[model samples]
Target chain A: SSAKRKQEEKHLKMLRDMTGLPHNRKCFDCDQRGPTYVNMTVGSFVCTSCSGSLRGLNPPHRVKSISMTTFTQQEIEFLQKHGNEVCKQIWLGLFDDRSSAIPDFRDPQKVKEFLQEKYEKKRWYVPPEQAKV
Target chain B: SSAKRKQEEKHLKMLRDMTGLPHNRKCFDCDQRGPTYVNMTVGSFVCTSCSGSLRGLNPPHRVKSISMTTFTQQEIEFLQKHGNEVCKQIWLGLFDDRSSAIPDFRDPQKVKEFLQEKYEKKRWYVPPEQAKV
Candidate 1:
């Protein structure tokens, strides 16, 4: 077997393992089962519908096809660090888990609004308390 | 084809793409080719020798096998955000490129010393300017 083939096998195994982990088992954005893409800019996995909504942001998130796209080392590493679980803590820290405003994957308008609030406006981000000047 | 098998293929392709990226083609710690593991704590890809060194840190880095181990979504995203390039900037910011103190992978004693300086002692980390208290 070629060295490249061996390398590919290794890479494949790693990704497969990642997909089986806790938060990775589902899509980060829409809670879909086994998402096929990752939001490169944000380090979270998104289903096709959610990926589409992420692309519509003002400074659009980089969405890569987990199936077809080539993952950069930087990209893979970033994903390794900040996955859905980690990102949710930062992006949804202040979110009310029971809020009905959370969008369904099928609802484009709502999806866009939810993502914009999370990433753009940072409505749910928990800021560190500032010391008085 | 089984759904699980299809999922595996997608994962393999993504890892292959990541290994081909610039900084990822080489190890973060020792500059070796196609590192086989990630230092999960710091989000950098490392070769076996460097991974060994990373493991010896005071608060050891979590090293995961790129070929065999599972990656949580958080681990993957962290890696994406802080691959060799990003980590190098933080860990080697004050290092002199021409310095002879850089360790050879084959030299274990030197490798340990070099890593201890870079990570534990933080000899090269650049700090931001501080205002008067």
Candidate 2:
């Protein structure tokens, strides 16, 4: 299918650029590092396992293929500029307390809900009262 | 003084890491793009021109030099995660209107005040009326 072919091409370009996300081989979703990755609808890298899991959710959570298919120049620039770690810091606030539980990607259902909480409702995080010492 | 040597070494590693800020060669302060950058008290890539401009200011606005000298794991993560562009998006709110005048680094005094406003008082930007279309 051309869909599969086009997806592969974009993934190839992403691998070459290796600019949008961190850990080129590491999936933003699951921990399975790889030489290849798929662009998710939410706009981050997903590994083969997480892609499968993502597909089961909403299109936003669905493993939308081909990052080239969408993105403003600003969006592309922003993603390339930052990585998974910076994102987790601002969005997840992981500085002082690193012991919190991140959702388990191994559980498909759990992954779905966690993505929802992080993206859709934007809950589970709060701005710090003051800068840390 | 060991201070100077250590600063040089850290600056060297920053060139190697090239991870904390975008455009390791491009100055975050001025338009002077180049092969090296200087870290300021406020923390961002500044070209030698901008570094000179950054200095001759208060310590916070002053050019500290050597990025490896600082960066909390979280701070490093966020910086490595994002770049000059992503930063402009989240911080500058530049998407539709690219016409706004960015300060010129050719002037050292304005650079001081601008850096002071951006980092210290956190003025010069407003949250969007709504996210850009």
Candidate 3:
């Protein structure tokens, strides 16, 4: 049992847990693979193609680096606390089930406005407990 | 050999190339290992302790996530262009040799100011190329 071998196994497992998760399989916007970018501001992964659309906006986007690097304590905590389930509950919960329309990243301007109005503008809300309010 | 296996190997190699770099082993600020946070604003790796100081500034630090995530094309290109060597020759080259002082993260305000003055203010520059200028 080489300590080196064990350490290698540990490393691979962690990456799998982080990057290979079912939810992490593709672009957050389009589910494309080989994505090498994340919009740190929005906490979503995107391919370089989509990143171009992001980089075009005025006031600019805060693009973050992911994959093969590390994270800050804050980022780790944010993901731990939300992990999208809560975001789905709060942010996306507003739409009617049959809305059938979702935000798209093909248009940088539209994505910027959508991200800004929803996130930067503080649009998410807490779901009142069932029949409790 | 399976095509699937080859793809997996390729993924591992790219991650190893990025995370296992000789210079990326520790906090860029303190050289501590197991850093998970990066001061995205300054594009440097740092431990959580340092990240705390960064997160405390009035204007706040723009911390970005790394590790098992991905990078936008801009960040990738930024690193390729500077990668600290030219930064060393400019922002750091001006210090008095005997001063022996480096910016520290113990104080958030100080670190913020230091980082702001060094990077956000566009203090870095290039030296004339030998036999070209």
Candidate 4:
């Protein structure tokens, strides 16, 4: 019961943090459970009644797009200089493989082609028709 | 012209990799341009015709819910042993603050409360009704 209680508390805390909505309120989307993953990029609140709209579900829901501003001049410059190298290291850490390198955006076409081929072979490519706007 | 041509080619290659559909295809959701973020969490592909359907636009797109399998025994063991410590270090690196420690999931409530307070004060809390399924 201690583990269960801890887990419930964790979930409740996550709920509160995720959607400022209080614990006592009924979900608008699911009308049953509490809200789950809140998209930090967008400010909209999704409810359990709309749980189907979450990113990982059987019949996934569609979300509106939120436009994030481009990187600041300094940030862009930093990225241009080190983003690829940093990202490559991060990817390597995650995958535990260092065979492939991060493609350079300086040569966008080559990078794109490389990604396409890799995704295709891995069966992970998202059809262009299926990407978000 | 050569630089521009190279840039275009790179973008085209990215388009193919980011979204698998061939070149010159019209997106189904955005309608105006090509698909951008294709959520791998869900199997459905987003299109440019319905770019708005993608996340990170002005209006923000909502995606469907998909369930992911739980970690295997080995993964669970690994996380149990080192997940918090590693995450704490990672967070420290990201925030450049080594003062706060990663709260142990072993004490879910404490972690939850910490996150709640953090989100609340930061004005980033999502309402309960807003999460996906």
Writing each residue's lDDT as its tens digit, candidate 2 over B44-111 gives 55666666655655653444343234533454444454445444444455323445445666677777
lDDT of 4 by residue, A54-128 (tens): 444323333322112222334323323322123223222233233444445345455444334333333223333
**Model 1 alpha-carbon drift over 4 Å, by segment:** A127-133, B1-133
Docking class of 2: incorrect
Top candidate, metric DockQ: 1
Model 2 lDDT per residue over A1-133, tens place: 3244334334333333543233443566554554123453434655666667656656545443432344434544545654454444444554233455557767888887766666555564434332121
Identify the superior model by DockQ, candidate 1 or candidate 4: 1
Worst 10 residues of 4 chain A by lDDT: A64-73
Worst 10 residues of 2 chain B by lDDT: B1-10
Maximum-TM-score candidate: 1
Residue-level lDDT of model 1, residues B1-133, one tens digit each, is 2355355545544555556566776788877566888888777778888888887777888888876764555555566666777777788777776873687779888888888888889888764221111
Task: Note the Cα lDDT for every prediction shown.
Answer: 0.70, 0.48, 0.50, 0.31
List candidate 3 stretches off by more than 4 Å: A1-15, A30-35, A49-61, A96-98, A121-133, B1-133
Tens-place lDDT per residue, model 4, B1-133, is 3233333333333322323223212222222343333322222233432323234332344432211222233432332332222322322223323344334534545544444333333222333233211
DockQ of the candidate models in sequence: 0.05, 0.01, 0.03, 0.02
Per-residue lDDT tens digits for candidate 3, residues B1-133, read: 2234334534443443444444444555444454565455645555677677667665776665555345555664454443323334554445444554546666666766665555556343334252123
Q: Which is superior by TM-score, 1 or 3? A: 1
DockQ, Cα level, model 1: 0.05
TM-score of chain B of each: 0.80, 0.50, 0.51, 0.22
